[model samples]
Target: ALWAARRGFVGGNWKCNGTTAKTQELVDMLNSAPVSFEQVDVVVAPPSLFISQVQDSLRQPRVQVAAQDSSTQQAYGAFTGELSPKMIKEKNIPWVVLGHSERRAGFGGQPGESNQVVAKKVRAALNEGLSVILCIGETLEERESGQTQKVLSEQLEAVRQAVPEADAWKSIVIAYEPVWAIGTGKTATAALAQETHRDIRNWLAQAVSPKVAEATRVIYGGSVKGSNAKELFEGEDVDGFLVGGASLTGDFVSIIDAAKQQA
Candidate 1:
């Protein structure tokens, strides 16, 4: 099955960074930048507090807004400091990023989201008609132990079982982020990234269907920068990127333009 129709999808996860004023500044920059790639899809996931403001402020047609995370609960409950998918959907925000490594791995000894927890969140987001950039990856130890594929398979299988519906994946983009590389100044070489991305597409073909595998966007993350963006997206299976620190600067425009050049 050919994936010629898979449009490039890039997402910037601001991830608890930036003040309101700074957020607007970033939005202003994106609004003013020119997108040369017509075959790319762009989304920015800000903190929940700024989702609506950014969504309202964005003027670029190719760029959209996504929330960093959302609650698994379906109803309006007493879940303190949690925002439900329904609430996010009501604001007309079209996308949400779930199961990021930060959310899966706790900080400062605090507990983080487990596979079960993230799967539940994925279903909830889908139920509310929000597209999801579902993140999956392996820890440094797992990678060293030759368990990178094993860990990613388990994470994806959990979501597969949770969603069950065949059409659910249409709204999902699997973000393969190596936990070892995220924010560590380490990055997966293009060869390694392409190999893993191809494996992921094969996983989808068997776990879901060939059509879904061919059509779904499987993007790469973890220390992705404008300098390496072209090589990363050069992979047949690597559709685009999920940028971190670089997304906040002028370099993001270059990253986006890289996808454009490849497309």
Candidate 2:
């Protein structure tokens, strides 16, 4: 854990899943997880409609709520389906995850969130004072041809140029989820993950500041499970995780525990 003092963050992206019946059930599971808030930051994102259900039912006061995604174009009006950060803030949600790979790639023949669009969304979310989980990664196409660094740099560069306040970066946590590892039946090893984490920090230092580079929490995602969680957390630069499927299960407790306790 490079930023061991940054407090480990475990975020569950319940992307487009969860029903009224499963909402309370999953909330209960998270509520019963045996971990201290000081040891880890447990944030969860349910489908937008289910947020209130989880928010009101979640018993852990320290556990936070997050929006899966918010408006990329504007703060208000004209964008019918987009959730504004203003509304998200009014709902008392303190965090929002933007630039996820799914959104980056788009869906159903729609245009994906271009890097510029994601940068805009990140800025918009920050303008509303919401903490952000900024997702960045390369595609399988880039990974195979040794273009990972170039692709990652471009995605990060978008945010670097868009978000002017270097200090504002304190509110952002970059989740490096290699698009290749997610659904390609391949997993990024601890060595590879650590290398990239270091590279991300290196780029941040040159592109931003040494302070931002060291202080910003860069966590890993794509495929996180209790079985592999310990080793992943052991990576020197791996501060925490942005878990997916495993986050909904009781096994997530073990994954949460995998974080080294600086407290």
Predicted model with the maximum TM-score:
1
TM-score of each: 0.95, 0.95
Task: In model 1, state the lDDT of residue 249.
Answer: 88
Model 1 over residues 77-194: C-alpha lDDT tens digits? 8998888999889888889899999989878999999999999999999999999999999988998889988888899999998998878899999999998889997989999999
Flag regions of model 2 displaced more than 4 Å: 1-4, 261-263
- lDDT by residue for model 2 (103-148), tens: 9989999999999999999998898889999999988788889999
lDDT of model number 1: 0.88
lDDT of each: 0.88, 0.87
User: What range of 10 consecutive residues in model 2 has the weakest lDDT sum?
Assistant: 1-10
Poorest lDDT segment (10 consecutive residues) of candidate 1:
254-263
Q: For residue 196, give model 2's deviation from the true position in Å.
A: 0.1
Error of 1 at 94 (Å): 0.9
lDDT of 2 at 89: 87
Q: What is the C-alpha RMSD of each candidate to the true structure, in Å?
A: 2.0, 2.3
